[PDB]
Every structure is written in structure tokens, then in C-alpha cells.
Paper text:
In a double-blinded, placebo-controlled phase 1 human clinical trial, the recombinant, germline-targeting envelope glycoprotein (Env) trimer BG505 SOSIP.v4.1-GT1.1, adjuvanted with AS01B, induced bnAb precursors of the VRC01-class at a high frequency in the majority of vaccine recipients. These bnAb precursors, that target the CD4 receptor binding site, had undergone somatic hypermutation characteristic of the VRC01-class. The GT strategy for inducing VRC01-class bnAb precursors is rooted in the hypothesis that these antibodies target the CD4bs with a similar angle of approach to VRC01 and use the same conserved contact residues. To verify that VRC01-class mAbs elicited by GT1.1 do not just exhibit similar sequence features to VRC01-class bnAbs but also target the CD4bs in a similar manner and with the same atomic contacts, we selected five mAbs for further structural characterization.
Moreover, VRC01-class bnAbs have very distinct and targetable genetic and structural characteristics. Specifically, they have restricted immunoglobulin heavy chain variable region alleles (IGHV1–2*02 or *04) and a short five amino acid light chain complementarity determining region 3 (CDRL3). Finally, GT1.1-induced VRC01-class mAbs are structurally extremely similar to VRC01-class bnAbs. A subset of isolated VRC01-class monoclonal antibodies neutralized wild-type pseudoviruses and was structurally extremely similar to bnAb VRC01.
Numbering used by the authors:
A (entry chain H): 2 to 52, 52A, 53 to 82, 82A, 82B, 82C, 83 to 100, 100A, ...
B (entry chain L): 2 to 27, 27A, 28 to 91, 96 to 211
The structure:
């Protein structure tokens, strides 16, 4: 009993994307296949279902005319094709299988797929620009110092930030990335350390952006002001 | 039907009873409701099917009930793994969701401010970071003031999840400006307001 889906894809605005969902561990034709997307931070949004036997689907009125749900009974794989992709179509697209019900109410989704990340953007891949959040008198409050790194203007997700090659983990907060008006993500990672160790211990943030194959190490040197 | 859930932020300590709500007003009484639990990076997991029937593999602490339009999902005792978002479903409609959060004593944020780095100023972009460290609850109002003038639309903010140790929140607030606009003002500050308290950390551009 499993539901495997296609890998994550990135599409330009106005393009189309097709997502697969192969079924295992059960009879594919005995249950409907529903598609529900979830925007980042939003709730669940039902899109439509499709009958494996006949192939006649039913779409929500929001997606009507833009979604085409097909299936292949030979490989037990269902497909969802969304066209005219907009900037707000960036969401995780799941496939859910309703269970057999005593009252024949086939809407209790007990089996789910891991989801497919579909990102719609008009941006090109760019390496992160890492700037230092230098500790100073504006970040030293009673023996505690604050410092960090600003990971700005990178695309696409994700990035991984560590400190001292993973040796420093206590009091480290890496914020979730925010999508800027330029279409590039930007986050920042911070850490609080004793102000006595600013002049002796060295602190380096390690930003890794595998999509661009760029690995930036930045040394945060304390200021004197 | 239209499904509404409340409260969307139910902060409770571990080990006590949690009660959730789901209102299916735009329906008849279709006792065909369902309950789900979703954790970050994971797909929703079915908990309750029908009005009160427990799904297979769901522990006894989860239970549901309903009367016409008002439905409740109740957890008798809150386990550490029960702090997540919950959704209710009737046919194809989904509620806005309810987030169960660990309740802790009120903590004031540690407000730090970072001027734009000299390296970043060379590229024509200036970013000022306001840091709120280990506070509670998640509610907080951060306002940017440049030369005692409130800013609007030129800042973004992100919040970390509850820390695994102290169950606190950290909030970042970045003010993005150009080099030309940054050079024409001296005083920069962010005003953090939380529960009749307004801490304002400031700096001057030069110096």
C-alpha cells in the first residue's frame, strides 16, 4: 500500500506541468483518485477526481478548463495536467485515494502521496549573496552577542546553513526564506554567543546552494562600534 | 458547504485536554465529516472518519462528535507528537485549519538590530535586519521607523518554528532599501510591540 508521485518540477508562467501518481499495494480501478494541492502556508484545496474505469473526471470550477486528469490502468498511474500556470499556482500537489466506505461515501482519504513540488516563477537560477551580520554594541546586551549571515538573492529553494562546519548548534535560528519582489528568495541565519568569545573564537556560516552547485563560507568578524 | 475551524492557534500545555471546532454551516447535516493531522513536510493523515468513528491505527485519545453544524475533535491528553495542524473535510471542502501549539510562560523578545554591511552597500542594496529572539506568544508587531517616519511596504518578516528546547519563537524583519535612499537618512529603528510594551532599538548610519 503506497502512492509514489513524480519528482519536483519548475515551470515558467503560462506553461503546463504534468504530474504522475503510481499506485501500489491495492487494486487501482476499485478506488477513485483525487488531487489536492496546498499552497505554502495555506490549507488544502481540492481540485478533482477521476474514475479509473471509464476515465470521466470531475473538476472544481476554479480549475475547470485548465486541468486534465487521465489514467493508465496498465501501470496503475494517474496523471494531472495543469495549464496556464500562474505565480499563485506554486503548491505541493498530492494524490489521495478514498477508502472503501460502509455508506459508499468515497471521500475519506486514508492513503496519500508524498506530494510533488511545482514552482512557477519567471526567474533564473542564481547563487546566494552572503553578507555578514557583524556583532557590535548594537547586538551586545549584557554579556550576550548576536551575529549572523544574510542569504539574499538566490533561486530556487532550498539552501542549507550551518555554523563552524556544524560544530556550533546551540542557539542557532535559520529563518524560513521569503520570496522577494524580484522573485528571489532571501533568508538569514542567526546565533547568540557569549560576547567574551568575540575576540577569540571565530564564527563562519556555511551556506550551501546545491541547485547552483555553489557553497559559500562567510566569516563574521566583529565590529568595534 | 463552507468549513470554518477555530481556534486557528490553540496553545495548550502537554498532557491536558484539547478541543477543536469545525463548523459546516453551508451544509445540511451531512454527518460525512472527517478529521486529519498534518505535520510539516508530510501529507495529511486521517484520524476520524464519519461523525465519531476512529480510523485504523489511531490511538484512543483522538475522538470526534457533532451536532448538525458544529463538530468537535477532542484529544483527551496531549502527547508530544500531537502538536500539529488539523483540518476537517466534508465532501471536497476543507477548513482553514487549527494549529495546536505548546503553551509556555510569556517571554519578551531579545531585540537586536543590524545595519547594512559595507560589502552589501557596494552593490547598491541596503538591508537592515531586526531580530526578535526567543519570545512568546507568536504575536508581535514590528514597525520600521526611518528618521521617526513609519515605513510601509518595504519590509518582509519570517518566523521560525517553536524551538524544540524552550518552545519559543524567533522572528526576523528585513527592511530592504536602495543605496541612495539609505544614504539620505541617519536614524534607523524597529519598534517591537508585545503586550503593552514597545522596545525600540535604533542606530545612526554613520557611526
Amino acid at each position: 500500500v503506497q502512492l509514489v508521485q513524480s519528482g519536483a518540477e519548475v515551470k515558467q508562467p503560462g506553461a503546463s506541468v504534468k504530474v504522475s501518481c503510481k499506485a501500489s499495494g491495492y487494486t487501482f480501478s476499485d478506488h477513485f483518485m483525487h488531487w489536492v494541492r496546498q499552497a505554502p502556508g495555506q490549507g488544502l484545496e481540492w481540485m478533482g477526481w477521476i474514475n479509473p474505469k471509464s476515465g470521466g473526471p470531475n473538476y472544481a470550477q476554479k480549475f475547470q478548463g485548465r486541468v486534465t486528469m487521465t489514467r493508465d490502468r496498465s501501470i496503475s498511474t494517474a496523471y494531472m495536467e495543469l495549464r496556464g500556470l500562474r505565480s499563485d499556482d506554486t503548491a505541493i500537489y498530492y494524490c489521495a485515494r478514498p477508502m472503501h466506505d460502509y455508506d459508499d461515501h468515497d471521500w475519506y482519504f486514508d492513503l496519500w502521496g508524498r506530494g510533488t513540488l511545482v514552482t512557477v516563477s519567471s526567474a533564473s537560477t542564481k547563487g546566494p549573496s552572503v553578507f555578514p551580520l557583524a556583532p557590535s554594541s548594537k547586538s551586545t546586551s549584557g554579556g550576550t552577542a548576536a551575529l549572523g549571515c544574510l542569504v539574499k538573492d538566490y533561486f530556487p529553494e532550498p539552501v542549507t546553513v550551518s555554523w563552524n562546519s556544524g560544530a556550533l548548534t546551540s542557539g542557532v535560528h535559520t529563518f524560513p526564506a521569503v520570496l522577494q519582489s524580484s522573485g528571489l528568495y532571501s533568508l538569514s541565519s542567526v546565533v547568540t554567543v557569549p560576547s567574551s568569545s568575540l575576540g577569540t573564537q571565530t564564527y563562519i556560516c556555511n551556506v550551501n546552494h546545491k541547485p547552483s552547485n555553489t557553497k559559500v563560507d562567510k566569516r563574521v568578524e566583529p565590529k568595534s562600534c | 458547504s463552507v468549513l470554518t475551524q477555530s481556534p486557528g492557534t490553540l496553545s495548550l500545555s502537554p498532557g491536558e485536554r484539547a478541543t477543536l471546532s469545525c463548523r459546516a454551516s453551508q451544509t445540511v447535516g451531512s454527518s460525512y465529516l472527517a478529521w486529519y493531522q498534518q505535520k510539516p513536510g508530510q501529507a495529511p493523515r486521517l484520524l476520524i472518519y464519519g461523525a465519531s468513528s476512529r480510523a485504523t491505527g489511531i490511538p484512543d485519545r483522538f475522538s470526534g462528535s457533532g451536532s448538525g453544524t458544529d463538530f468537535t475533535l477532542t484529544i483527551s491528553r496531549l502527547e508530544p507528537e500531537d502538536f500539529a495542524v488539523y483540518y476537517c473535510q466534508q465532501y471536497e471542502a476543507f477548513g482553514q485549519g487549527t494549529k495546536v501549539e505548546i503553551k509556555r510562560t510569556v517571554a519578551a523578545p531579545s531585540v537586536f538590530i543590524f545595519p547594512p554591511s559595507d560589502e552589501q552597500l557596494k552593490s547598491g542594496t541596503a538591508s537592515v535586519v531586526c531580530l526578535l529572539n526567543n519570545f512568546y506568544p507568536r504575536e508581535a508587531k514590528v514597525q520600521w521607523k526611518v528618521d521617526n517616519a513609519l515605513q510601509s511596504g518595504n519590509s518582509q518578516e519570517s518566523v521560525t518554528e517553536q524551538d524544540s528546547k524552550d518552545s519559543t519563537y524567533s522572528l526576523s524583519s528585513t527592511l530592504t532599501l536602495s543605496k541612495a535612499d539609505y544614504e539620505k537618512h541617519k536614524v534607523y529603528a524597529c519598534e517591537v510591540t508585545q503586550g503593552t510594551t514597545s522596545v525600540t532599538k535604533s542606530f545612526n548610519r554613520g557611526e
